[PDB]
Amino acid sequence: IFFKKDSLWQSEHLEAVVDQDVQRTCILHGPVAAQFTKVIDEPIKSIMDGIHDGHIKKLLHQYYGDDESKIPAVEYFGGESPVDSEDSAVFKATSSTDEESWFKALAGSEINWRHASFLCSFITQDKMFVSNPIRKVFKPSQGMVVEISNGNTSSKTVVTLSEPVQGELKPTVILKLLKENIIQMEMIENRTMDGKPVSLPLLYNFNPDNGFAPISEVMEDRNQRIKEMYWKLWIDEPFNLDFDPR
Amino acid sequence: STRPLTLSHGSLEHVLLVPTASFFIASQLQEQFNKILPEPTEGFAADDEPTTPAELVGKFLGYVSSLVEPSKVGQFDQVLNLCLTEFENCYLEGNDIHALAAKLLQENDTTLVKTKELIKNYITARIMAKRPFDKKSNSALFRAVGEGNAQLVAIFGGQGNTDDYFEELRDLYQTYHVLVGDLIKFSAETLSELIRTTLDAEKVFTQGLNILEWLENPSNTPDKDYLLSIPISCPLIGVIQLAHYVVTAKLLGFTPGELRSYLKGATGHSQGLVTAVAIAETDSWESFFVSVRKAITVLFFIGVRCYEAYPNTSLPPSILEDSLENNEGVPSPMLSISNLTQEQVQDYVNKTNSHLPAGKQVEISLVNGAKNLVVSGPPQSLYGLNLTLRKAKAPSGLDQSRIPFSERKLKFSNRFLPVASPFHSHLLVPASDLINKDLVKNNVSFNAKDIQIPVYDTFDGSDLRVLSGSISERIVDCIIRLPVKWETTTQFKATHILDFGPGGASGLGVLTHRNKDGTGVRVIVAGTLDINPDDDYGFKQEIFDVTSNGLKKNPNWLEEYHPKLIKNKSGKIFVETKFSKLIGRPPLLVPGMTPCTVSPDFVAATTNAGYTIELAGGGYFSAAGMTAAIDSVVSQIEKGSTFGINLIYVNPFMLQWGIPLIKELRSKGYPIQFLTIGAGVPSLEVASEYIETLGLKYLGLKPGSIDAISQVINIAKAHPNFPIALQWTGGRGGGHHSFEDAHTPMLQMYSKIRRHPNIMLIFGSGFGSADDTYPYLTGEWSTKFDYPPMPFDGFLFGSRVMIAKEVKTSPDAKKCIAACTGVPDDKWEQ
């Protein structure tokens, strides 16, 4: 036990070995994989990119006649489980409508901000991975109608959900696009003192370079934007947060 | 104007709206069938009683059809036509009876005997009703063939598939009497004619060859030792195959020429090859029996002449005792060696032939697969070989898992075939010339122009038609003495195969399926109606199925797992595999390594290098010390990056805080994408807990040997929609390594893994470049082993990465790792 216990950490910290002599230490290493460990301090990204490209270059030569153009493009490459087109669409949610089928119908076939925003099971709050609110909101139930405008042109596409507000049926959610990589889930409140509804912008960044979770929630002045909304509902002053609590 | 008429078997009933015109005779046959039908029992377990309303109606149809005479137009006929059409449009939803029968077996608590009793009833009822299958069936399979989306080849099984083979002929007679009972009696009288025709046939047929007598009355049926005797068995298997062909042609509603035209080629195993060429030449229903008489004749002669040259002899009762008392077969003139290569067996038979004289030397008869040979000779000499083979084999209940792969004792099986003649051995050579004098006697010769579809020779694999010499001479030469090179002859490109021969699911169909698993080609056993639980080969129903369940294609690995490329909006090129699709990063990962991937700075760097790495838990002791590590990763990485955690299974103390910690971080939502379990595979309950509680994306497992891989497969099956990275590594891996070879366990499991779409099969161990990994992405790495290509979804690098910039290994260690020369994959086990 004395001889053998704790026998690995020594190689990483040759300063805490008798002579700073590596020949004392135990280094785990694969006999076969020892044929390719020859260049020291080669950067991690240099090796990995160097293997991947070594792959891409071969596949391209063997299966695309060395023509890069032939490669199929996508919005973003990720978040596709290994289990397995009309513009002005409408969808009527019942109590019995399937969850998956409903979300596949919302997303559409083409890989675009919609596809991510309705199928990404997660989103990124800072570094944290919080469950997707857009899959929570468009969980199907009685009343809600989902209209899609410019549905075959992503950039212009705007999904509107509408629900029964006091017997009559009004729009609740307007998920649309701001500037290229900004998704505004404009959540509307109609039941107000003056009848003039209050629009909450739940902004989200859309990064296609993160194939896994391309949807991140905007948190800078996100409190301020919920404050501005609750300053319209509750307060009847002009909005100002620069007042001392004391 | 139709009055209701109800018929019941206890709780279950059916109703037919009988026209008030034909109500009296219907209501008369109603009480008649109700007094024939026995009392309802609990569970309906007993025989001769329906379990379902389809089976009840079927029995009614059968009972009615029995009272119907097809010559005389009776008052039973109009009600028969009314109740038959009622069954059809109530139960046969366009689909064939065989598909319905298959759904009854799959869904209901109906036995297979009940199903065969339903189907014979329906067919009987269909024939007496004066309603043949003149209409060309809408069977999905043949529809796809006609449209050119498929290609068929018909194979024909030979001797030694099964011992109890006569019970197939019985089953065909009993079930499809009304379809094949004309062929059976025609064959019967043809054999009877050939007995007293031939000078010395009556000698060998001691207990006669009145096949119709034994079929009609099972009591009269001789012992199986007489039935396996080749002069009887040969032509009778011939008749079994032809009867399976006719059944096929009739149910489809084609002529024997029309079905032959649908096929792109046909071949047989040994004496099935003769049926193939007889089926190759058939054209109409009328000129069918000219081809049959040819097939019967040739099969009768080869069976008589072979038996006369070398008959089975008295065997010493000591040898029979010794083979029985070691869980080995009764000696016979063929022995099947499974899980040994052709070269090994050739060496051992060369050793045997050394001592033995020329007259008793044994030679390899069939090469069924790469690792499945059959040696033929004298059963005493084949015992003398079986003794040599029993030395080398280790006990089946021996654990060699802890022994290095190449120092293990090679384990195989060796069982005697159920056959009564040394086919494809020098012992049957004298018969050759005698058969040709008998073949020319009956003028039973095949012309090249008469054959329309190609038939493949069993020895060289070439087409029969192209032979400039006598086709009858060559096909005799093939069956009696020339060895079968089965994988030479079966190298045709075809989308489907039809097994007609004997054996059902033990015969030739399943052997070909195993011998070209994963090349896409589907095998359908056309012999018997049954349910395959894995659905890795079809039964009769899939021929006659009219829904999309007919044209089921077997996965082709090369094309289904073809590594692709894709580009992002930014225009970065990813390798597109199963793995990469999920993670949305290149399909490489650096696996959890203690102490190299314990450093938060390394994990962070590699994550920020656009690759997937696992935080090694092995360097961490407390929930706190790990939590502080992770929060040092999270600080460094980019927003919406992720990294995995590599917990060892064998360290219980590590798991008891490690698992709950991850559960807390994931319930709070830290960027922990996945968990790897290194050194061990968890139990089904513990693995289920990790999946359904820790709320990961996927779960990595590192199986050490075959038993582990199996256990992984079980866990994936238990959670079909949850993705499961299988991180396979050999014994050649760095760190804690098993004794397993890198390659062989994947040859032996690639099939069984890929049948579960949620397993993301990652090859690892001995990788540091693209050149050495390319053939395992392409799949070609399996071609060296004589398999179809087997592409892998991803790759892990363990050793290669340890001389990186960001790994905290001390510079003089890095120098020492570099200075290691290393050895190729063949040497490492030193």
Ligand SMILES: Cc1cc2nc3c(=O)[nH]c(=O)nc-3n(C[C@H](O)[C@H](O)[C@H](O)COP(=O)(O)O)c2cc1C
């Ligand atoms: C220093 C070192 C530490 C390792 N530590 C672990 C570990 O903690 N858990 C584990 O499952 N595998 C460990 N491995 C095995 C790797 O995860 C991987 O299976 C193996 O390195 C791949 O083989 P290769 O090293 O020949 O590439 C380690 C390997 C090395 C070289």
